[PDB]
Ligand binder design. Structure first.
Ligand code: HEM
Ligand SMILES: N[C@@H](Cc1c[nH]c2c(Cl)cccc12)C(=O)O
Length: 344
């Protein structure tokens, strides 16, 4: 039914199935060490598989990203106990920079490494804490990530589709159905994840680390390239500084394609800006214009069905949240309102 998801999931699975450092049984031991707060043990465990003499030259993106995933869980772990991994692990930083080069991504772990590039089986899944809530946390992202990537593709395609065309409404309705997975993610999180366990036990593992003379943020669903999708959809031309800064902050953490998608659309008006300009020039008595705008409004409706419940979720945990959440929600409502005013 959401048939575009399959190829994305299949590329994720290629990385999930890769164990080039033969680290599976070793990374499974990390949660026990984190529970004991055993920093020397954690370093000693990494040094058991960490390449000291470089990366095998037969490797490609898949193996390098898999290697970054396995070393990566030790990065957030060591920082969680108060230590810069690059300061406490000999030869680690060069390795991290080599993997950042091989994958064209930061020299640490990201959301991608800890979720969709991370195998799902109990005898294989990598984790910081080994907690049920962490298992649930990773799954919440696996629900929607492949659908999100498909949604980005659909958004780029929709950009060049004229509102006068019946394709616009059809494409808009299809983009909605993919973004509905974002809502499924939140419903799943609110049902299965303890806010208190997240804040007290999970969140301490996602702090920044210093590599190469700069700071790199830890894994978060904030790194999901939804912001790129909405760059193209509504936000590219926005003059909100805080929002611009927010997008530029997480940009390095997404796949290179989406960094390129983002670059391509910064110089153009957003989809919403073109669609509304077209609607005012043609008229709303054109049925394809009416259906186009109606379906586009439902796209904004589903984004809000993710974003509003997600704010409550974050505030519930931080009751045990960064204000940008509220600001982004307000912006999205304004965009939806513009689409509504196009029909009222
Ligand atoms: C208890 C669970 C969760 C908490 C406490 C939480 C909290 C937060 C916080 C505090 C931010 C602000 C950015 C920052 O970290 O500084 C944020 C942003 C974000 N989060 Fe979550 N989150 C949770 C679950 C999820 C889930 C399940 C998803 C989707 C799978 C998700 C997707 C996003 C996205 C896409 C953003 C960027 C802002 C936006 O699009 O509105 N989060 N979240
Ligand atoms: N969405 C929030 C909560 C979060 C932290 N790490 C996460 C992971 Cl690893 C998966 C899903 C959500 C989160 C964030 O990006 O910080």
């Amino acid at each position: 039914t959401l048939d575009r998801v399959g190829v994305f999931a299949a590329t994720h699975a290629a990385v999930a199935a890769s164990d080039p450092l033969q680290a599976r049984a070793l990374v499974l031991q990390l949660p026990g060490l984190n529970r004991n707060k055993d920093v020397p043990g954690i370093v000693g465990l990494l040094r058991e598989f960490l390449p000291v003499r470089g990366l095998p030259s037969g490797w490609g993106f898949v193996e390098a990203a898999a290697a970054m995933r396995d070393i990566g869980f030790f990065l957030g772990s060591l920082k969680r106990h108060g230590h810069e991994p690059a300061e406490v692990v000999p030869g680690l930083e060069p390795v991290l920079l080599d993997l950042a080069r091989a994958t064209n991504l930061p020299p640490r772990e990201t959301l991608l490494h800890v979720t969709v590039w991370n195998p799902t089986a109990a005898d294989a899944q990598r984790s910081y804490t080994g907690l049920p809530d962490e298992a649930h946390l990773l799954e919440s992202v696996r629900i929607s990530m492949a659908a999100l990537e498909a949604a980005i593709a659909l958004t780029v395609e929709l950009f060049d589709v004229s509102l006068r065309s019946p394709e616009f409404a059809q494409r808009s309705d299809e983009l909605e159905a993919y973004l509905q997975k974002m809502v499924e993610s939140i419903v799943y999180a609110y049902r299965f994840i303890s806010p208190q366990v997240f804040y007290d036990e999970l969140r301490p593992f996602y702090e920044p680390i210093r590599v190469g003379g700069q700071s790199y943020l830890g894994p978060g669903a904030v790194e999901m390239p939804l912001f790129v999708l909405e760059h193209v959809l509504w936000g590219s031309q926005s003059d909100d500084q805080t929002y611009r800064e927010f997008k530029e902050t997480y940009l390095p953490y997404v796949l290179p394609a989406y960094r390129a998608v983002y670059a391509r659309f910064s110089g153009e008006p957003a989809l919403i800006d073109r669609a509304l300009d077209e609607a005012r020039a043609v008229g709303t008595r054109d049925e394809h214009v009416r259906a186009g705008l109606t379906a586009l409004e439902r796209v904004f409706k589903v984004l809000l069905r993710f974003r509003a419940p997600h704010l409550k979720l974050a505030e519930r945990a931080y009751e045990v949240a960064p204000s940008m959440l509220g600001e982004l929600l307000t912006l999205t409502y304004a965009a939806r309102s513009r689409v509504r005013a196009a029909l009222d």
